[PDB]
Ligand SMILES: OC[C@H]1O[C@H](O[C@H]2[C@H](O)[C@@H](O)[C@H](OCCCCCCC3CCCCC3)O[C@@H]2CO)[C@H](O)[C@@H](O)[C@@H]1O
């Protein structure tokens with residue numbers, strides 16, 4: 350594989366769409382690679398990680414408990430609720446909702462959690478509170494994946510998302526236990542995690558949250574590193590490409606391969 354930056358360019362050429370990418374040291378925030386890092390991209394399902402960071406902040410403040418059981422109705426359910434559709438009778442704890450939202454990308458679980466933090470506006474306010482003046486959530490799960498060209502709703506930038514994830518995972522804005530919980534949920538992703546491990550060389554650590562939307566929108570926020578360590582945060586978004594999901598996945602994997610083959614930078 351070619352150098353990271355060259356592979357990223359090759360990916361845009363082949364997809365006919367824009368790619369946004371940031372590679373950052375998790376411990377220090379050192380930016381290694383940046384491509385269209387200040388450009389907007391639909392967050393799609395990657396917003397679920399930031400959502401649970403806001404939830405954990407509420408738990409830390411004593412305004413929420415991961416144990417608290419939330420009971421909901423069938424009418425509350427939206428498209429793709431693999432886990433939540435199974436608990437109409439017994440409900441789900443806030444913590445379970447976050448696990449389902451992040452590890453299974455359960456949309457109703459995400460909406461239920463979104464309500465607890467004040468909806469899209471409330472989550473955006475939380476982002477503003479931790480210093481992210483760019484990322485914005487405007488709509489609820491399902492609608493936020495529309496990805497209309499030139500539409501600023503429900504977007505982030507690679508640089509903003511990377512910095513925000515770093516703040517949630519390591520800045521001690523969240524308690525030690527909460528930081529550990531947010532990390533574990535990403536480590537436990539069932540949608541892409543197992544697959545990514547099956548193609549990663551031995552020794553490489555992976556934690557992640559993926560997303561997809563209209564007009565080719567695709568995204569992944571991840572922690573990656575050799576020696577089984579979460580050394581770097583890697584955020585990649587794709588937008589406005591007519592490519593098949595398979596090829597968009599292949600291109601993202603290709604950028605990953607370039608990182609792996611040329612890690613020491
Ligand atoms: O020299 C380094 C490595 O080169 C190859 O590894 C390949 C691997 O066989 C292939 O499956 C993967 O594809 C990339 C799979 C990446 C999956 C997604 C990664 C995510 C993580 C962070 C966010 C975006 C992408 O590339 C590597 C590097 O060439 C060899 O097979 C391996 O034995 C060797 O140790």
Ligand SMILES: *C(=O)/C=C/N[C@@H](C(=O)O)C(C)(C)S(=O)O
Nearest residue numbers: 393394428429490491494560561
């Ligand atoms: C998160 O990225 C979810 C993506 N797609 C879903 C959505 O809420 O828009 C569906 C329902 C379209 S499906 O899960 O892809």
